[PDB]
Amino acid sequence: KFPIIANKRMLEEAQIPKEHNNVALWVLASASCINYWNFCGPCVNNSEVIKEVYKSRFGRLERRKEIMWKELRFTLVDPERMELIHALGGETWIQEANTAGISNVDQRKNDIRAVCRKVCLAANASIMNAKSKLVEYIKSTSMRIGETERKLEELILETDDVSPEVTLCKSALGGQLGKTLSFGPMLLKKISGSGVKVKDTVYIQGVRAVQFEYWSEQEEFYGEYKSATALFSRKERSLEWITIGGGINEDRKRLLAMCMIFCRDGDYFKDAPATITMADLSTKLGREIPYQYVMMNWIQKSEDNLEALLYSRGIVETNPGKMGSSMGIDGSKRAIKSLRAVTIQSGKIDMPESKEKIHLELSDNLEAFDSSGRIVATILDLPSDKKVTFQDVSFQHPDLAVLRDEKTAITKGYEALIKRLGTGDNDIPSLIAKKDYLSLYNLPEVKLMAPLIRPNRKGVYSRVARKLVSTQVTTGHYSLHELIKVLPFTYFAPKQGMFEGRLFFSNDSFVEPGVNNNVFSWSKADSSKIYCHGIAIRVPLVVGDEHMDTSLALLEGFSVCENDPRAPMVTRQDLIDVGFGQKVRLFVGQGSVRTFKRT
């Protein structure tokens, strides 16, 4: 009851009465006494002393306030910060927050590569105008790259960063290459040998057949994955030998699988898995796909497929003196048993360099060819479309971006509803002052927003919205905010039914009267503003009382009145059987109760 101890003179000198409002507060004392002390008591000025004594904590706070937060990225491992290492970088994720240093080049590289991927994907919507639409997109895409407002017709060339997208977009510009290759996310290169194309078949389900191509001669290559390296030699649709020098489990499994597909080694190039027969669709929406990229996509779906692919490669028992250089099914460095024709080692294999630049030729599918086939890039080797916000960018030509979603549609609808006000005749305030609400149910903007409404039960929404509108106009008590809020629903015809308390658009979002929401919010002391997903919008007018009268904007046939606990709680359904002169409480939001009276 009074566990907390206290002082005596310190209490009386402050004149703290016990049982102020039936709370004893107290030598001993309660805990509420502290609340009474901090709400009504003596006033000091000791801020400077507190700051000086606790200088370390407030200096830590200052430093914290002196941060410029940056982006974060999920990845792995191939003093002033120790105060924050917990929140700076973990093990699977990390945040690049900086303090004073600034240099915007690698982020600029990421931006340019992202936009190049974007444009090259956008051009994949026809069968004939590929190069044309591509180049036109390029010419219609400018950027505020870094600090200079440059165009996207010279950066792709001035830059030196190998990538499937950079090459796929620069070949159309007759730009120089570096003899590098790109089979999917992997990066390849030739070392020695050469060959010619040859065709073969592969079954699906054991009955059908599909044609693929390969090389019959011997040829050595240099595969490479994130945090991995390798060297290998392909001979007659099969992988002869291979070695790896980058030690990671997942990077070694994926790199080996990619190099195997590149060598088409394995029986799954004779027959196919029972999972592919479920589809047998080596095709896009309206285009064709080779067998290699289909197999790859089948790999990306699940690691069980990766393990099966690796089992297709022969597994044997390691011999003495080779454990140090063996491998395992899961990328284990050494194991009693390993895979056939494999060799692990430490240290990344030094990659060679080719100082011979060339130019390729694009095809219908944008596939580039330097010579003797030897595809260098394509769209097939790209990730799926990933929407990402682009800034410091200008994209004018059609297909730039759909830029059409229900959220944006609603935002624009509400912007139009707000502008319609226009402080003039044939607009909201004139019809209000005239008490002509029927015209409100016929404006154009509401008709433009109508498609955004839930279709199944739009009649009841319209009924309730017209009720609110008319009841607020006729009486003359209204609030432009709630009006504009419910107007988009006063278009269709009214009907009978059950209403619940929320008005749903077609994207499952909603609006509710007498309450606030992300889609639509407002408050007094800022009535000149209307938030839309946090985007503050302005009112073409000014009001100090037109909104202050919301007694009729909460319910349909009721009006707020003074609070009274005696009044009984009800729901929105029993409202039908209430009478007059009968007060009733009701929830108007989260833990917000208010009293109402009919009419």
């Binding site: 002390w37 901090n38 006033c43 000791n46 973990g90 454990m323 460095k333």
Partner: protein, 615 residues
């Protein structure tokens, strides 16, 4: 349909989902007690793991003294635990470890520990889990029993004005020789006080992750506390320099040790050798550590150093070689219909032996010799959760062994050891010599009492193992040591608990036991626990509790609701990047100056020192 929440283990790993197998951290509702039957079973198994039958009647108690050290007999069926230690091999392993680390290694460490002890104030002893008063004969926090002891010294033979560890220790020593001793009022004689000082009590508390095998965690008295602290300080100064010792700290450093070990191993052996790992769990780690061997070992350590440490380090061991264990509450009698029930204490169980059941009788007669009044003169073993550091030193000594018998065959081992859990890494060039190496290791371990279990130790190729709940793998090291606070058990103040909980969450994030979303969820849960403990709520909430009443009226006088404190109808403002920063420091510039100065008023009747404390 059926359900099996394990099929997710087929197409997934185990290092990512093993955590879902254990319940969530918290206080165990089991209420694991320390009854008499359990204590008697413990003492029996202790005397048995001693494989000897030698004895020597004492002179201070007139009681036998099973001397189970350096006298192994009954070799048969030796795969089961043993506790008989050999001094020769023990000192040999210690010398090997010294040779590896260096010559002036033990000397340097003991000197550091000494100098550290000198400037220490005895008041530190107030920092302890729990103890056992030797006057009231109960369990209490450390501060209470310390005050009792000092005021008893005052009441009996004047005050203790040392104010230092050394004077405290010498005062304890002197008290061992006083014939009469007083305390608030009554006094006692020499023998009774001696016994009381060497008593131990069985505590039921066992709170941690992993396993709650500490049913009967032993809590000593107050006389021996400082010597135990000294020995642990020395053992700690030693355990830091050892690479294969994951006891003193955990988490980030523990992973550093793990990966360093694995990489050094891979870089050590050759192309013909292939290694293997084993996850071991020593069984009966408390019923096979004898303080006699610790005494000999501490002697070997301090052999060349200031005689001060020679005598000091030799105190706690002998105090544990002679330890009376308080038998718990005695049995009860009852008639056939159970309508009547008699209750007897431990001191009288020897008076009604003819009634107790057989299983309870055969478990009591062989020990009747060693009972004195209500306690049992246990001359060895190590029941308390004490000396973990020193036991770890012995384990590390076990792992640093190597000779020529192995070298000739081209095999070796290494690994890592916590208090009673370890991980072994064997190396060889044959799928048979591995067995020979493992058996050699088990033999050298059994020579000095450190045993190993067979139903709880498994093993496989190098990729997979476990250590202190940190399931290591090629990558994705998974931890399971997620701690959290608990207010109801430890209620202090409305201005400290929250900062402590935030600091705890921060630590857990450092140790990889928590991730961003998990940390935020944990924070929003601990905030609510705080509120419910101290009975405080925000202003938005429509609560009607006492503390809210006044807050429900003196609230409209303020606008900086954000600046309000959680303790005063406040709202949360801390987040991931603002844990080290207390909420006070984060809301100072925002609180309305009125409320601010009303809080930071040093002229009040009562971490940022707030006007929210409960003295």
């Amino acid at each position: 349909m059926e359900i099996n929440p394990y099929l997710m283990f087929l197409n997934n790993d185990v290092t990512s989902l093993i955590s879902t197998t254990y319940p969530y951290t918290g206080p165990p509702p089991m209420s694991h007690g320390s009854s008499t039957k359990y204590t008697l079973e413990t003492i029996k198994r202790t005397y048995d793991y001693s494989r000897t039958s030698v004895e020597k009647t004492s002179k201070v108690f007139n009681i036998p003294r099973r001397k189970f050290c350096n006298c192994l007999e009954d070799k048969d069926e030796l795969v089961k635990p043993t506790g008989n230690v050999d001094i020769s091999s023990l000192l040999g392993l210690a010398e090997m470890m010294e040779k590896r680390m260096g010559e002036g290694f033990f000397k340097h460490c003991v000197m550091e520990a000494e100098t550290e002890i000198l400037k220490m104030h005895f008041s530190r002893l107030t920092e302890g889990r729990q103890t056992y008063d030797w006057t009231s004969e109960r369990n209490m926090p450390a501060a209470t029993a310390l005050q009792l002891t000092v005021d008893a010294i005052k009441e009996t033979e004047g005050p203790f004005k040392g104010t230092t560890m050394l004077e405290y220790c010498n005062k304890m020593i002197e008290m061992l020789d006083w014939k009469e001793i007083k305390f608030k009022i009554d006094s006692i004689k020499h023998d009774e006080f001696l016994i009381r000082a060497l008593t131990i009590n069985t505590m039921a508390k066992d709170g941690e992750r992993g396993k709650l095998q500490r049913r009967a965690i032993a809590t000593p008295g107050m006389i021996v506390r400082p010597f135990s602290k000294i020995v642990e300080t020395v053992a700690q100064k030693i355990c830091e320099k050892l690479k294969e010792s994951g006891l003193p700290v955990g988490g980030n450093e523990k992973k550093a040790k793990l990966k360093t070990t694995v990489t050094s191993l891979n870089a050590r052996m050759n192309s013909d050798q292939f290694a293997v790992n084993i996850t071991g769990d020593n069984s009966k780690w408390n019923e096979c550590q004898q303080p006699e061997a610790y005494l000999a070992l501490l002697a070997y350590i301090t052999k060349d150093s200031s005689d001060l440490m020679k005598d000091l380090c030799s105190v706690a061991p002998v105090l544990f070689c002679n330890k009376f264990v308080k038998l718990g509450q005695g049995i009860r009698l009852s008639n056939k219909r159970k309508t009547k029930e008699v209750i007897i204490k431990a001191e009288k169980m020897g008076k009604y032996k003819n009634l107790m059941r057989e299983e309870y009788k055969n478990l009591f007669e062989p020990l009747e010799k060693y009972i004195q009044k209500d306690v049992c003169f246990l001359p060895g073993g190590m029941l308390m959760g004490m000396f973990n550091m020193l036991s770890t030193v012995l384990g590390v000594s076990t792992l640093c062994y190597m000779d020529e018998e192995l070298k000739a065959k081209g095999c070796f081992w290494t690994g890592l050891q916590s208090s009673d859990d370890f991980v072994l890494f064997a190396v060889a060039s044959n799928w048979s010599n591995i067995h020979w190496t493992i058996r050699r290791f088990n033999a050298v371990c059994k020579l000095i009492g450190i045993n190993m279990s067979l139903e709880k130790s498994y093993g496989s190729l190098p990729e997979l193992f476990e250590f202190t709940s940190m399931f290591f793998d090629g990558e994705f090291v998974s931890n399971l040591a997620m701690e959290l606070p608990a207010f109801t058990t430890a209620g202090v103040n409305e201005g400290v608990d929250f900062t402590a909980a935030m600091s705890i969450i921060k630590t857990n994030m450092i140790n990889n036991s928590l991730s961003p979303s998990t940390a935020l969820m944990a924070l929003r849960i601990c905030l609510q626990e705080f509120r419910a403990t101290y009975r405080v709520h925000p202003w938005d909430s429509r609560v009607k509790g006492g503390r809210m009443k006044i807050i429900n009226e003196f609230i409209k006088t303020i606008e900086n609701k954000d600046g309000l404190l959680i303790a005063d109808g406040g709202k949360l403002m801390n987040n991931i990047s603002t844990l080290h920063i207390p909420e006070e420091v984060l809301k100072f510039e925002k609180m309305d100056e009125q409320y601010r100065n009303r809080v930071f008023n040093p002229k009040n009747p009562f971490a940022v020192v707030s006007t929210h404390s409960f003295r």
